[PDB]
Design a protein around this ligand. Structure first.
Ligand SMILES: CNC(=N)NCCC[C@H](N)C(=O)O
Ligand SMILES: [Zn+2]
Length: 236
């Protein structure tokens, strides 16, 4: 398919009518460009301010893997073990409300103005950290709210598939995993998942300073291309 459209600081109104109401993904430029975190977040800064804090870490290349597990460690431990010193295994600090834990970090980001278009309240917006090495994969899944994914460090390759295309995504039947596809997007078993081939999609390479809008229930897959650090805002 095609690329996600990029737009330089679209107005509330036009963001609302063109993307939010109809549920169309878009990359917003010029918005997160000047937030303090783009200039200062780096390994040394992360260690200095968060080094000693305990954090959940996912070990294993993909969360749908049989051998995937979850563990806890300090930030310094995570960086030395899964990022810096030739990691034996894949470690991802994922989906963690790090700003709740380290409130000094929260001044480096801002809640995007477009969040105010939803009929929910500011403080109920969930802000998650996503930090890991090159090569981390988040398998094809859907979320229950709107999402603003801001890229601070590195790049990410992302594939988006519409919620209307769900039939072709072969979601798990378990209930726990109903929001996760059974397909490995980048090397799909087309003998087992033949409908996946036809399903149209959008893709992009999200880069630092860019905000991707992922509409509620829109399926998304993410693979970090470099040492990456993203911030997601879930809102309604
Ligand atoms: C949480 N595991 C993560 N590495 N995969 C990407 C995110 C999937 C998560 N289930 C979500 O709601 O976005
Ligand atoms: Zn997600």
């Amino acid at each position: 398919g095609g690329t996600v459209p990029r737009l330089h600081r679209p107005s509330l109104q036009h963001f609302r009518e063109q993307f939010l109401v109809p549920g169309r993904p878009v990359i917003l430029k010029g918005v997160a460009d000047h937030w303090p975190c783009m200039q200062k977040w780096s390994l040394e800064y992360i260690q200095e301010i968060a080094g000693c804090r305990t954090v959940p870490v996912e070990v294993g290349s993909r969360y749908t893997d049989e051998e995937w597990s979850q563990t806890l460690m300090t930030v310094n431990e995570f960086i030395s073990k899964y990022i810096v010193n030739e990691p034996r295994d894949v470690g991802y600090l994922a989906q963690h409300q790090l700003f709740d834990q380290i409130p000094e970090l929260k001044q480096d980001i801002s809640i995007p103005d477009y969040c105010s278009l939803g009929d929910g309240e500011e403080e109920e917006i969930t802000i998650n950290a996503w930090f890991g090495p090159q090569g981390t994969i988040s398998p094809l899944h859907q979320d229950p709210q709107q999402n603003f994914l801001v890229q601070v460090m590195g790049r990410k390759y992302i594939r988006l598939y519409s919620p209307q295309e769900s039939g072709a995504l072969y979601p798990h039947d378990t209930h726990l995993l109903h929001n996760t596809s059974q397909v490995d997007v980048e090397n799909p078993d087309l003998e087992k998942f033949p409908k996946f081939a036809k399903a149209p999609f959008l893709s992009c390479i999200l880069s630092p300073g860019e905000i991707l809008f992922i509409p509620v229930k829109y399926w998304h897959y993410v693979r970090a291309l470099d040492l990456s650090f993203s911030v997601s805002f879930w809102w309604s």
